[PDB]
Amino acid sequence: GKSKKWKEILKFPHISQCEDLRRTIDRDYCSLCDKQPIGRLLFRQFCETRPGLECYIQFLDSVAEYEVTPDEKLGEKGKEIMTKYLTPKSPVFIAQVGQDLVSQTEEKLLQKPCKELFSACAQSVHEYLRGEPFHEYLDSMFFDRFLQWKWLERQPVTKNTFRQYRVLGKGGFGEVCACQVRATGKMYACKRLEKKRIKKRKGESMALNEKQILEKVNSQFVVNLAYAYETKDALCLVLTIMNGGDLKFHIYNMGNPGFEEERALFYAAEILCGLEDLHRENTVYRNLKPENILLDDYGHIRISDLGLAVKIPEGDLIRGRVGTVGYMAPEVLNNQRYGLSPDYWGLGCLIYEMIEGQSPFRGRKEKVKREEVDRRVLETEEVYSHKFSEEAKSICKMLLTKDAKQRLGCQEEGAAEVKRHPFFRNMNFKRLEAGMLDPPFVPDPRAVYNLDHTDDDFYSKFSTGSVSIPWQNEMIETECFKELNVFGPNGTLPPDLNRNHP
Ligand SMILES: Cc1[nH]c(/C=C2\C(=O)N=C3CC=C(C(=O)N[C@H](C)c4ccccc4)C=C32)c(C)c1C(=O)NCCN(C)C
Numbered sequence: 001g002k003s004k005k006w007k008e009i010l011k012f013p014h015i016s017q018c019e020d021l022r023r024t025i026d027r028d029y030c031s032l033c034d035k036q037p038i039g040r041l042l043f044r045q046f047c048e049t050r051p052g053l054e055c056y057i058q059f060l061d062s063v064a065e066y067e068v069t070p071d072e073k074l075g076e077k078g079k080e081i082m083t084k085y086l087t088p089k090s091p092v093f094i095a096q097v098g099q100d101l102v103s104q105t106e107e108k109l110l111q112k113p114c115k116e117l118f119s120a121c122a123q124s125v126h127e128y129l130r131g132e133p134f135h136e137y138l139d140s141m142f143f144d145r146f147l148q149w150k151w152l153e154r155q156p157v158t159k160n161t162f163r164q165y166r167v168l169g170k171g172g173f174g175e176v177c178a179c180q181v182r183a184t185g186k187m188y189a190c191k192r193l194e195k196k197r198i199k200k201r202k203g204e205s206m207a208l209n210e211k212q213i214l215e216k217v218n219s220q221f222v223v224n225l226a227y228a229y230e231t232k233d234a235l236c237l238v239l240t241i242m243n244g245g246d247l248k249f250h251i252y253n254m255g256n257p258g259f260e261e262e263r264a265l266f267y268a269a270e271i272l273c274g275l276e277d278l279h280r281e282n283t284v285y286r287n288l289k290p291e292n293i294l295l296d297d298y299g300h301i302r303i304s305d306l307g308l309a310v311k312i313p314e315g316d317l318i319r320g321r322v323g324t325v326g327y328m329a330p331e332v333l334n335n336q337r338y339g340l341s342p343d344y345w346g347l348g349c350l351i352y353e354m355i356e357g358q359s360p361f362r363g364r365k366e367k368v369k370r371e372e373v374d375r376r377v378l379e380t381e382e383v384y385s386h387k388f389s390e391e392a393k394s395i396c397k398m399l400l401t402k403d404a405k406q407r408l409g410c411q412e413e414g415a416a417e418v419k420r421h422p423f424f425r426n427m428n429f430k431r432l433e434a435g436m437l438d439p440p441f442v443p444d445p446r447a448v449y450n451l452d453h454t455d456d457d458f459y460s461k462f463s464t465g466s467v468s469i470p471w472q473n474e475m476i477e478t479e480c481f482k483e484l485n486v487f488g489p490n491g492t493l494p495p496d497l498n499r500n501h502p
Pocket of ligand 1: 173174191245306
C-alpha cells in the first residue's frame with residue numbers, strides 16, 4: 001500500500017543536487033558495488049552495457065550457485081561452470097584468470113569436488129573489477145544514479161514518514177508498535193521509547209548502546225534497524241517485524257513440551273549464525289532465552305531484544321550481573337569478568353530446552369527459589385535423556401561447561417568451532433545462510449501467536465535517520481527501485497541525469 005504520490009516522494013533529484021555527495025562518498029569498491037544493495041545492482045547494470053564485463057558477472061553468479069549446490073550435485077555443477085566460462089573458445093570466456101589458474105582448477109575437478117573450488121578464480125575476478133571497470137563505472141551515469149539514490153536515503157526521517165497501526169506487545173522503557181512506510185508500504189515494528197521515562201531512570205547511555213549495536217550489525221538472524229528518529233515524548237527504533245511468534249510459545253504451547261531434535265537443529269543453527277554476526281562486532285547478546293527468539297512469516301528466526309547487549313573493547317573484558325534467572329552463565333552469576341562466553345552458555349540452554357521441553361536446571365513442574373536455580377547452574381551437572389542423540393548431548397554439555405575457558409566456541413576460533421560439532425554434521429550452513437533450507441514450521445498469516453540542552457545533544461546522536469543497507473533493501477523489496485530506476489530510451493541519459501537542462 002504505497003502512498004498515492006509515492007513517485008513524488010522518491011522523485012530523483014537532479015544530479016546537480018548530489019555534487020556534495022560525489023566528493024564525500026568514499027569510493028570503496030566492496031562498499032559501492034557489493035555491500036550496498038542498490039550500488040551492487042547499479043554496478044552489475046553498468047557491466048551489462050559492456051561486452052567484456054558481462055561474462056564476469058555471470059560467472060560470479062554461477063559460482064554463487066555452486067557454493068549452495070548439494071554435495072552429490074557438485075561435480076555436475078562444477079563441470080558446467082568450466083565448460084561455459086573457463087574454456088578458451090567459449091563465447092563468454094573469463095580471461096583475467098590466467099591460464100595457470102584455469103589449468104589449476106581443472107585438477108580440482110579431476111579430484112573430489114569442494115564447495116570452494118571456484119573461490120580462487122572468483123577472487124581473481126574481483127581483483128580485475130576493482131581496477132579498470134570500477135573506475136569506469138564511477139564516471140558513468142549509473143554512479144550518478146547511485147548518488148541520486150543516496151540523496152534520497154539521507155533525506156530526514158520524520159513521523160509522517162511512517163504510519164502507526166497497532167501495539168505488537170510491549171516491555172520496559174516503552175512499547176512496540178507496528179508501523180508502515182507510507183511511500184514504500186513496507187511493514188516494520190516501531191519500538192517507541194517514552195522520552196520522559198528515559199531521563200527519569202537516567203538510562204540514556206543504554207538507549208544509544210542498543211541503537212548503535214542494531215545499526216552496526218546486518219544479519220538474517222538478528223532484528224535489523226532501518227530507521228531511528230525522535231518525536232514528541234518518544235524516541236523510536238524501526239525494527240524488523242516478526243509475526244511468527246516467539247520460540248517460548250512454540251516450545252510449550254505448540255510443541256510436545258519441546259521439539260524433535262532435527263527441528264531444534266534448524267533453530268539452533270540459525271541462532272548460532274545470529275550470534276556469529278554479533279560476535280563479529282565483538283558484541284555480547286547476554287540475553288538468550290526462548291522468548292527473545294522470534295519467528296517471521298516464513299518460519300525463520302531472529303534474535304531480538306539487544307537492550308542488554310554491549311560492544312566489548314577488543315582485548316578487554318567486561319563485568320555485569322545482568323540477564324534472566326536460569327539463563328545467566330556462571331561467570332555472570334559470580335560477577336566475574338567475561339567476554340562472549342555467556343552467549344555460548346545461552347545457546348546450550350536453548351538447544352537443551354528445545355529438545356527436552358524444560359530448562360536444564362529447573363523442571364517445568366518444579367517449584368524452586370532463585371537461589372537454588374543459581375546453585376544448580378554453578379555446581380550441579382545437567383542430565384540428558386533419550387530425546388538427545390549422543391551428538392546432541394555432546395554439544396549441550398560442551399556448551400554448558402561451567403568453566404568459560406573450556407567452553408565450546410569460547411576459544412580463538414569462535415563460532416566456527418561450534419559449526420564443526422557433530423551435532424551439525426548434517427547442516428549445510430552455506431545453504432542455511434542463503435535461506436535455501438525450508439524451515440520446519442510455517443506460521444499462518446492470519447494467526448495470533450524537560451527543556452534542558454543536554455537532552456537535545458543526546459537526541460542528535462540517536463536520531464541518525466535511515467540506515468543505509470536496510471533502507472536500500474526496502475527500496476528493492478517493495479519494487480520502488482525497479483519502478484523508479486528508469487534511464488533514457490536506447491542508452492540515453494534521462495532528463496534528471498543530464499546537466500544541460502535541469
Ligand atoms: C508481531 C509481533 N512483533 C513483536 C515484537 C517484535 C518484533 O516483531 N520485532 C521486534 C524487535 C525488538 C523487540 C524488543 O526489543 N522487545 C523488547 C522486549 C522490548 C524492549 C523495550 C520496549 C518494548 C519491548 C521486539 C520485537 C511481537 C511480540 C509480536 C506479536 O507476537 N504480537 C501478537 C500477535 N502477532 C502474532 C501478530
